[PDB]
Design a protein around this nucleic acid. Structure first.
Lengths: 198, 142, 52, 106, 76
RNA sequence: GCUGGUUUUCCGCGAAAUCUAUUUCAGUAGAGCGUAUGAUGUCGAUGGCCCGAGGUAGAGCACUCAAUGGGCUAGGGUGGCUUACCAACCCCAGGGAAACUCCGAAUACAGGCCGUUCUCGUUUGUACAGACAGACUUUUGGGGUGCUAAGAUCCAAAGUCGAGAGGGAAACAGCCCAGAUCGUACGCUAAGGUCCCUAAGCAAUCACUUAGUGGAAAAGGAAGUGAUCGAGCGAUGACAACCAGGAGGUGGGCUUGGAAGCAGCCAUCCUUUGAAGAAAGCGUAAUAGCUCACUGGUCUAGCUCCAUGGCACCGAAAAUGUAUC
RNA sequence: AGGCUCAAGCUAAGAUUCUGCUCGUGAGCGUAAUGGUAUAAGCCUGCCUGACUGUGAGACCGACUGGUCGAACAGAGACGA
RNA sequence: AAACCGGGCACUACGGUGAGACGUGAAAACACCCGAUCCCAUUCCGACCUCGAUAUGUGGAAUCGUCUUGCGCCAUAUGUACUGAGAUUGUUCGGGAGACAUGGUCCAAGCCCGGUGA
């Protein structure tokens, strides 16, 4: 899923306006360093608007992405490339349009602080679930440190044994080493269930 | 539905805004939700009427609600006491008597949020609130 | 509604004068933003006189 | 910070303090680097001569020593900056009385 | 029993800004309590007015700790 | 202090309807604003640099008030250990506001320094007065209002008018352009316009709509038309379409004076397995049945829904006569 | 002149309670509200009476009548080493 | 000597601030350990301050300076919110936060006084 881009030399209103209006997204790659320094690009709005829905995760930014950064003419000219993570997608309130794509570099294997959801899986069979047990899933997504290489695609929690009045905390999540949670204390419950009314 | 406890009262009406806080929102508490496309104002009876509509809807489709509960949050609360003079009076000589609260609704607030086990019978109650509400809303989700 | 302030409709032959003043101020700020120094870098005789 | 300069610049502030081995005191300038006068019992020439280098005796001695090293060095007046817990009783009373009777006026 | 009262505008505030010269006796600011504390060569009234004491420019100083400001004078 | 009247001519300049006060509103004084002249002024006009405390729009919850869900519970209640019944506190999220501020812009403003500039346009002396009832912007931002803005009222800054004629808005103080010294059957624009009334193109180039939309008015409804990214489909045949049962447990179990699919509840489970739910709708006093999800070949081909969106449509009724280009 | 640091939260303890840790302006200031303030303007002890006569350079605001702050001078004084 | 350590002054928020684990003195230094006699301490009390004594006891990690995580600010990115001047009843030109993101939590500068060989 190589994304394509063409640079821009812009700041705030005035120019990003025409980019959007012809159909183009003002995006920014930069390295995890400081001043922060990488080129200032434009993805194509067609490319990005289709991509977020295709993943089906409104946090699709959990996934490392790869950029052709065309500098030249035509459909492209092979030029500088990018291995960057999406750390932020500024989706417009108005209807679902897009405003900004934030890309931080991770090509080196250097660690990052990223987003992973907690999709509920065991919901087919669970003792409280078959008593009817329903819940308030306090946490649907979380932030995990860790390298660029072994990045997970998501966390698919195992709620099969959600006891009638028990809960899956943060510790019970299936991590990997060097993906130290370490940014939240594991005392935050990520679900429960309670027998409310048959 | 009412800021019943002590408040300053007689609030300046204040003109309505062209926008919300600029970051595209996410959802606060539930799977599916609804948001206001256009700013404006909603009266407490209006919002409560939409809530009646939705609760009673899932209750009707107890068939999808008799499992447990189908939890819903409404995230707007009446704020400003809309005041008004009687129907026949010389303008002036004071201000109106407080006769109903109102709630500023911006261009991206989430009015309704909920997790009804059926996406179908949740989007089906999506369009069943803009009928009883003042503004034009939109079916969003997590 | 009492005193009838008509609404002139923006019409192609007014779009004319719109784009006119547009290209005019375009030249204007163009040569100003050129003058970011005491130099003379503005190609001789930008139209300025077909302005009509 | 302390004095909140008012009308007449008044450099050469005297300030003193007491480790429970030696009494130290200074009269410092507004440039506040070149200590205009520095009187301590810790000095080379004063470890040995002065014996009881923590009581009011060493205190008043240091006061007298200074006051003379001051009147003779042409700084005929000085302003006191007691630290936060000080109080004109005892170990600072000695410095004060001694430099006030040395000739100086405060 | 009804609203609609006010008071003569007392005209507090800050007159002299950073750089504007002064002369002894010339009031700089009028405050209710002490919004700015006096700096260099400055007195204080009953109403805690701040006025200059010697000729010269003025500047502000912002103690980064506790955010307390001082208005101090730059004389010769 | 109220109403009306004040008779010749030319030229020069040229205001105000704001503020304070008042047995004050219909007045009049004092400031600001006009004029004449003289004196004292590079004073003023302004742009650039620099530097100066700002706490509004926005914003946020770090405080006060109102506040939603959740985690664990003091403490309650309820029976006798223990409670899907209340749970404070505390914590997690979420984020309201003229009288809240962890934050916080664009401005405007104080000043010095430089250019810019003039027919001093400045300050001030000395004599004259006028004015103290102002309107409006389908301007923009604010209090009262009808409900959120009456050609209202009352303020913030702007402009026009008033005291401004002239071309556009069919006609039109308050909107667009623009300041008439005078003569001229001269000339290039401005404002807006070029099928005709009316001076000037049925101009050209690329597409869209066929509603007189244009040439008035919303929630909602509605395969309109043409473009655009997706995607599902397809010579293991894509859809249209012909031809065929929707079975036996089964008439399930329950109700029931009657229920087999359908007055009406549980049940969604058995199996045959070509299909099949304890038949969807309709009913039949139960019936039966359909057809329904659910069918094999033939079809012979680009089909279908996703939105980016563009211009259409419907809602859309007044009074003498089309009467909203 | 000098000394003293609040109010609230947690342990004990639970009363005019008590004493440390955390709190940071939320206490306090005769009196409404706001701006003030941790050396403090607050609370305590001693002392007294400058809750002075006669002037005030300069400024702030205002139609005007006016009103506000003031470094400084002379005096008789108080507190303080 | 150059330089280091300690003590005092000074400067500084990237130079603060809690927090916790450390590494810890005696070589010198600072602190504490111990009393309360006169000066001081208490609205009761050496708890805190003070006065009076420690000849080499402890760093009680009491403070302290030390070692790294972690504690606010500093710096800046993309944008948006707002807004200036404009009228194509806002198709132009500028200015641009809060929050989200990143990184730093300095390179540096004195003066005196004691000490480490000098």
């Amino acid at each position: 899923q190589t994304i394509q881009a063409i640079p821009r030399e812009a700041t705030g209103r005035g120019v990003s306006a025409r980019d959007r209006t012809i159909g183009r997204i003002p995006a920014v790659v930069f390295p995890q360093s400081l001043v922060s320094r990488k080129q200032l690009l434009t993805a194509d709005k067609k490319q990005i608007k289709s991509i977020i829905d295709s993943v089906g995760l409104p946090f699709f930014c959990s996934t490392t992405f790869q950029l052709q950064i065309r500098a030249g003419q035509g459909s492209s000219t092979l030029v500088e490339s990018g291995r960057v993570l999406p750390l932020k997608v500024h989706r417009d309130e108005e209807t679902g349009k897009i405003l900004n794509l934030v890309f931080v570099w991770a090509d080196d294997g250097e660690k990052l602080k990223v987003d992973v959801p907690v999709v509920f899986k065991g919901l087919d069979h669970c003792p409280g679930l078959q008593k009817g047990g329903n819940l308030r899933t306090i946490r649907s997504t979380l932030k995990l440190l860790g390298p660029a290489e072994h990045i997970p695609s998501k966390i698919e929690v195992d709620v099969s044994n959600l006891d009638i009045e028990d809960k899956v905390l943060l510790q019970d999540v299936v991590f990997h080493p060097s993906l130290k949670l370490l940014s939240k204390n594991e005392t935050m419950p990520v679900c429960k269930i309670v027998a409310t009314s048959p | 539905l009412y800021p019943k406890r002590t408040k300053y009262s007689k609030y300046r009406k204040g003109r309505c805004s062209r926008g919300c806080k600029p970051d595209g929102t996410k959802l606060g508490f539930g799977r599916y939700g609804i948001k206001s496309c256009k700013a404006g104002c909603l009266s407490y009876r209006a919002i409560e009427a939409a809530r009646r509509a939705i609760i009673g809807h899932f209750h009707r489709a107890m068939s999808g609600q008799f499992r447990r509960n189908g939890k819903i949050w409404v995230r707007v609360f009446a704020d400003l006491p809309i005041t008004g003079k009687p129907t026949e009076v010389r303008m002036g000589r004071g201000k109106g008597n407080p006769t109903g609260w109102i709630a500023r609704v911006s261009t991206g607030q989430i009015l309704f949020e909920m997790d009804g086990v059926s996406l179908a019978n949740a989007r089906q109650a999506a369009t069943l609130a803009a009928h009883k509400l003042c503004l034009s809303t939109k079916f969003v989700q997590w | 509604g009492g005193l009838l302030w008509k609404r002139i409709k923006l019409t192609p032959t007014r779009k004319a004068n719109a784009k006119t003043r547009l290209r005019r101020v375009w030249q204007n700020e163009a040569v100003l933003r050129a003058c970011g120094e005491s130099d003379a870098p503005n190609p001789p005789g930008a139209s300025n006189t077909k302005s009509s | 910070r302390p004095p909140r300069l008012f009308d007449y610049l008044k450099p050469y502030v005297l300030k003193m303090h007491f480790t429970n081995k030696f009494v130290h005191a200074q009269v410092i300038h507004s440039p506040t680097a070149t200590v205009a006068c520095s009187a301590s019992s810790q000095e080379k020439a004063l470890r040995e001569t002065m014996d009881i280098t923590r009581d009011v005796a060493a205190a008043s001695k240091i006061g007298k020593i200074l006051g003379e090293r001051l009147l003779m060095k042409d700084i005929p007046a000085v302003t006191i900056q007691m630290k936060k817990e000080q109080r004109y009783h005892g170990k600072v009373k000695a410095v004060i009385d001694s430099v006030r009777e040395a000739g100086v006026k405060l | 029993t009804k609203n609609g009262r006010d008071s003569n505008p007392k005209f507090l505030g800050v007159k002299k800004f950073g750089g504007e010269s002064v002369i002894p006796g010339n009031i700089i600011v009028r405050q209710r309590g002490t919004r700015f504390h006096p700096g260099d060569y400055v007195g204080i009234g009953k109403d805690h007015t701040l006025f200059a004491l010697k000729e010269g420019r003025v500047r502000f100083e912002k103690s980064k700790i506790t955010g307390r400001k001082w208005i101090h004078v730059d004389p010769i």
